[PDB]
Design a protein around this ligand. Structure first.
Ligand SMILES: *[C@@H]1O[C@H](CO)[C@@H](O)[C@H](O)[C@H]1NC(C)=O
Ligand SMILES: *[C@@H]1O[C@H](CO)[C@@H](O)[C@H](O)[C@H]1NC(C)=O
Ligand SMILES: *[C@@H]1O[C@H](CO)[C@@H](O)[C@H](O)[C@H]1NC(C)=O
Ligand SMILES: *[C@@H]1O[C@H](CO)[C@@H](O)[C@H](O)[C@H]1NC(C)=O
Lengths: 205, 207, 206, 205, 206
């Protein structure tokens, strides 16, 4: 405990918080989605509600340490308020995101940070054809609200959405679920626009 | 990072927050609306729900810096809790406005601030005629709740509401959407208020 | 800005907040209601929902200043958390009051404070007869939860509720809306309370 | 106001907050209920919703003063955040208690504190027979969540629930309403566990 | 009171909060469930709502004291904000867990902490067959969100789900209720991931 207290003090009390990336010092953030349940579908309003968690990872040199100097501690957990976190947002949400997990992150000795908030999300989606055999396809884009592709680069570690925690007796069954980095370039402008597109194909079970 | 950390420390940790405008030192705020979706319409209660984001811009001398003194940094991002933001409110909302985006602002070296919160709003609107070809018109005023036109002047950069992010498979299609500066006098108060009136003409999509 | 920063520092950082009125130093608070919309009516539960804002005004000597000493500043805006505010409550609400406006007050150099929160309120009311020509009457009392009439006196400046912000195409139309100072007696206590009774007569816009 | 400011400063700024009762220094808390309205009854979920206010009184030597030393002030009002308050809870609530009044208490010079929060409560109750002439009886227990009867003794000042503020045009009428202290002793342990049982008999009007 | 005030000051004001367990200094946390009511069932969305309380126990050397030095105080109560608490979460909730009790823990002189929050939970469960004699079976997993089995070793304090506080006139009756630790190992990683699985068999009471 003494070792961890000394480590947290050295990281958080001495130096200030990471102020965020700039064009000179950009930051890669990796996203992965873990789908738990398609809870409901509203054809009256074209809204769908998803429960999932979202693994976010980035790496900062200011959060590095030598385990030997701190009783061989290789990682620790801390409140997400104690560190900078990225502003990743669902671009087409229709209600505030409801947080289902504690807001706590894992920091490892190489300066890697992992933050995995569980969420209930309502987003825009026309569910006509969900009651058929072919099903329906909906998509939602995740992006940094205020950082361009020159400051925050988004990527995924895999293209497959993890369905290992997907509830077997959900009202809706998953035909397909992918997560894909998309880069948009406009003729006008030099900076790319980056998003991660979550595409889910599903139908009534 | 060192340069940005020093800059944020100089701006936020040394000086206090901007205390808001006065009659001697008024402030112009520019508003632009970006409509995403008319989510629902309730004829039983005459309430309509809109999803949109709202670009707010203002300029403060207290947030200025010289890029040369901070490694040529021309701008940065910060939590909206770190700065004063204006008290712009929908005057006819029926439920508290729900925030859909992170509360983060962009500050540039000339002291300009840009803050663009995404929002879900329920407001008063009679939707009779939405199922027709002519559609229905609703209006909602946005204004400072407590600053008169002598302290906060509102403007728009354009009169056309941006529909580029509008959801193609919405139940409702937009016939027209304008944003217009107005001057209001209220029974409460002798000082006039400035509002931006968002007027949207829409109907059920025949799809 | 320098002048306003110095003023706010002199008022809020040096002295403590006003601790509230006592029997020796009572306080008058003026209330006006501005009705916006009767949003819904629930006959299954006898609940009605109102959207309105409530203008509250009082005066404190501890919030006075000389404009000459502060660049001719005659007033300013500040978070309602920075000042004492009165504990005015709807006595017959059935749900917590939902706040629709920022919690910000106007303070003027004579020590006058104006605080005007916009609110959605659910309160107890039997709406039988709302679909008729005569309509229905509902009433809700606003009062200090813990200060008697010897500490907080409530008044209104007018007996007519302001309907200038009332939504023209509301499902419900207003036949009458008054705001009236009363004295309220509780079994518990010998001291009377002052309330403002908001009485609204309305019907379906047929 | 100078006298009241000095008094509040002497009580709250100098000493810390009362840390709660112990077995050596127990505390009596008195509870009284004032019923305003039975708002709804849900037979689909066996939930009933009540609006009421709850008078809580206790007495602390740490909140005593001599009126002569403070301009003859015999009492004052203060935010409930400035003082310790008891952890009285409805044991059979089905939703978080919703607070309908400002969180403010009255403190008197003998160290008595009165705190009377207005509340909307959903609690477990089977309302079968509410539409009959006999009506239906429901009960809800109030207790300290973490203090045993050796630390907090609960009592009522009367056994009759005050119905003087009960809404005349409620959908439901009250046939009877009592509030009664109950003590439970367990084989395991020496300490008694105390609750106040609020029993309400009612029917459709 | 003086003794308890001095104790709380020595524990909380001098030292910082316990920063959480590590691989070098792991922590055992016990969970036990006390089921109060199955409030509702939604077959349209396959959601069920449960009211229960959850007894959590762990032990820390940083919260130890000698009763002789503090007027023979063997235990006290404190706000859960004053201490580290474990990050136990329902992994299959569909809405944020609603807290029904005050957030207060019991700390004893050997450094044992007991924290028992009451909660309303909506979780994923297909209730087809709840209206039958056989009933329906649902499960909900509880786990530390961010601590592996190398940091928090999570277990049950008892083998029985306590049904003694279960409401007799609930719409639903409990046929069976178990609580069980489960361990998962992944190809990626050496550390085990632990959950406690609450399995409840129930049906409509008629
Ligand atoms: C430090 O921990 C690592 C991780 O398991 C292990 O390989 C090593 O044996 C430990 N070293 C010491 C000095 O304890
Ligand atoms: C800032 O810009 C000037 C001119 O382009 C350049 O010489 C200088 O190296 C820059 N300063 C830093 C610290 O990068
Ligand atoms: C503004 O300040 C100057 C300071 O000398 C004073 O002469 C003047 O009277 C003030 N304005 C008003 C309207 O009082
Ligand atoms: C602690 O216990 C001793 C007996 O061993 C007793 O005499 C003493 O009074 C106790 N202390 C307090 C403060 O009660």
């Amino acid at each position: 405990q003494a070792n961890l207290m000394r480590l947290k003090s050295d990281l958080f009390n001495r130096s200030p918080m990471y102020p965020g990336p700039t064009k000179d010092d950009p930051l890669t953030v990796t996203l992965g989605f873990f789908l738990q349940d398609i809870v409901k579908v509203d054809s009256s309003t074209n809204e769908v509600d998803l429960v999932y968690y979202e693994r976010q990872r980035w790496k900062l040199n200011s959060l590095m340490w030598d385990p030997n100097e701190y009783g061989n501690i290789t990682d620790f957990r801390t409140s997400a308020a104690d560190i900078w976190t990225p502003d990743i947002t669902a671009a087409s949400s229709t209600r505030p995101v409801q947080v289902l997990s504690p807001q706590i992150a894992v920091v490892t000795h190489d300066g890697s940070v992992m933050f995995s908030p569980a969420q209930r999300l309502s987003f825009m989606c026309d569910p006509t054809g969900v009651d058929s055999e072919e099903g329906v396809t909906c998509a939602v884009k995740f992006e940094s609200w205020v950082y361009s592709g020159f400051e925050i680069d988004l990527k995924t570690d895999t293209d497959q959405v993890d369905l290992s925690s997907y509830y077997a007796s959900s009202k809706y069954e998953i035909l397909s679920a992918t997560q894909t980095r998309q880069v948009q370039h406009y003729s006008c402008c030099p900076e790319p626009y980056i998003d991660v597109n979550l595409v889910v194909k599903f139908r009534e079970r």
